[PDB]
A paper describes a structure:
Serial crystallography at conventional synchrotron light sources ([name]) offers the possibility to routinely collect data at room temperature using micrometre-sized crystals of biological macromolecules. We show here the versatility of this setup and methodology by performing structural studies at room temperature (RT) of three additional enzyme systems of biological relevance: (i) Klebsiella pneumoniae CTX-M-14 β-lactamase, a β-lactamase relevant to multi-antibiotic resistance mechanisms; (ii) Nectria haematococca xylanase [name], a highly active xylanase suitable for industrial applications; and (iii) Aspergillus flavus urate oxidase (UOX) in the presence of the long-lived intermediate-like 5-per­oxy-9-methyl-isourate (5PMUA).
In the case of N. haematococca xylanase ([name]) the crystal symmetry does not change with crystal size. The structural models resulting from refinement against the RT-[name] datasets are the first RT datasets of this N. haematococca xylanase. To inspect fluctuations in data quality and indexing rates, the run was split into 40 independent datasets, each consisting of 1000 detector images, and processed with the CrystFEL pipeline separately. Next, 1000, 2000, 3000, 4000, 5000, 6000, 8000, 10 000, 15 000, 20 000, 30 000 and finally all 40 000 detector images were processed together with partialator to assess the number of indexed images needed for a full dataset. Going from 1000 images to 40 000 images, the resolution at which CC* reaches 0.5 (the typical cut-off level in macromolecular crystallography) goes from 1.83 Å down to 1.5 Å [see Fig. 4(a)]. The alignment of all the residues of the active site (S19, W21, Y76, Y80, E89, Y91, P101, R125, Q139, Y174, E180 and Y182) is slightly worse, with an all-atom RMSD of 0.519 Å and comparable with the all-atom RMSD of all the residues (0.583 Å). The same alignment carried out using the 1000-image dataset, instead of the 40k dataset, resulted in a slightly worse all-atom RMSD of 0.630 Å. For just the two catalytic residues E89 and E180, the all-atom RMSD is 0.151 Å, overall the residues in the active site align very well in all three cases. At the same time, the [name] system allows for uninterrupted data collection without manual intervention or the need to enter the hutch, enabling future automated multi-parameter data collection for multidimensional serial crystallography. This was demonstrated by collecting 40 datasets in less than 30 min, wherein each dataset had good statistics and usable diffraction to a resolution of better than 2 Å and each dataset took 40 s to collect with a PILATUS 6M detector, corresponding to only 7.5 s using an EIGER 16M (Dectris, Switzerland) at 133 Hz. If a higher resolution is desired, longer data collection times improve resolution, i.e. recording more indexable detector images, with a sweet spot, in this case, at roughly 4000 images.
Numbering used by the authors: 5 to 193
The structure:
C-alpha cells in the first residue's frame, strides 16, 4: 500500500509520499503552509511544499518541527541532464541522513557551517525511472527549525566537488520520517 500526491496548492508545488497511509496525515494549508503528523513508528514518508521547477532561490521557512526518532527537515530537489538528487538538511532526529556518503568538505552559509557529502545511487528509483545518478548533501551543523536558505551557495559549492547541476525539477522543503513519530507545521515562501 503506497500513496503519492502532488500538485499545486496555495500557489505552491506540493508533493507527499508514504508507504503507510494509515500512520501519516499530510495536510495542505493556505499559501506555502503544510502540516504533517505521523504516529505508531510505522512507515516511511516524505512531504512538503515548494516549487516546480526549482531555481537558485532564497528559501524562507518557519514553523514547528517535533520529530521523535528517525526524521529530517530539508530542502530537497532534483535536476535533469545531469540527473542529480540533492539535500540541504536543516535538522534531523536520531539518525544523520548523510551516513554512508563520502565527505567532500565544508561551506559556511546562512549562519552555520554545512558539511558536504557526495554519493552515487546505482540502479535506484529516480524521477526518470531506475537510473544511476549523483547525490549532493549539505548537512547543517547548527540544527534549526526556521530561517533562510541560500540554495545558490550550495549549488556553487557542490559544483566544485563533482558534476554541476542541470535543469531543475521540483524543489521542496521536505519533512521526512522513517518508522518514527512526530508532528510538524511549516510555511515556505
Amino acid at each position: 500500500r503506497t500513496q503519492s500526491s502532488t500538485g499545486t496548492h496555495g500557489g505552491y508545488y506540493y508533493s507527499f509520499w508514504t508507504d503507510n497511509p494509515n500512520t501519516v496525515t499530510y495536510t495542505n494549508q493556505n499559501a506555502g503552509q503544510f502540516s504533517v503528523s505521523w504516529s505508531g513508528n510505522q512507515g516511511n514518508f516524505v512531504g512538503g511544499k515548494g516549487w516546480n521547477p526549482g531555481a537558485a532561490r532564497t528559501i524562507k521557512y518557519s514553523g514547528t518541527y517535533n520529530p521523535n526518532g528517525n526524521s529530517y527537515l530539508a530542502v530537497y530537489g532534483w535536476t535533469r541532464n545531469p540527473l542529480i538528487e540533492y539535500y540541504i538538511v536543516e535538522n534531523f532526529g536520531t539518525y544523520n541522513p548523510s551516513s554512508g556518503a563520502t565527505a567532500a568538505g565544508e561551506v559556511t552559509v546562512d549562519g552555520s557551517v554545512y558539511d558536504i557529502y557526495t554519493s552515487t545511487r546505482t540502479n535506484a528509483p529516480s524521477i526518470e525511472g531506475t537510473r544511476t545518478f549523483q547525490q549532493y548533501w549539505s548537512v547543517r551543523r547548527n540544527k534549526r527549525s526556521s530561517g533562510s536558505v541560500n540554495t545558490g551557495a550550495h549549488f556553487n559549492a557542490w559544483s566544485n566537488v563533482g558534476l554541476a547541476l542541470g535543469s531543475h525539477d521540483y524543489q521542496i522543503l521536505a519533512v521526512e520520517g522513517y518508522y518514527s513519530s512526530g508532528s510538524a507545521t511549516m510555511t515556505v515562501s
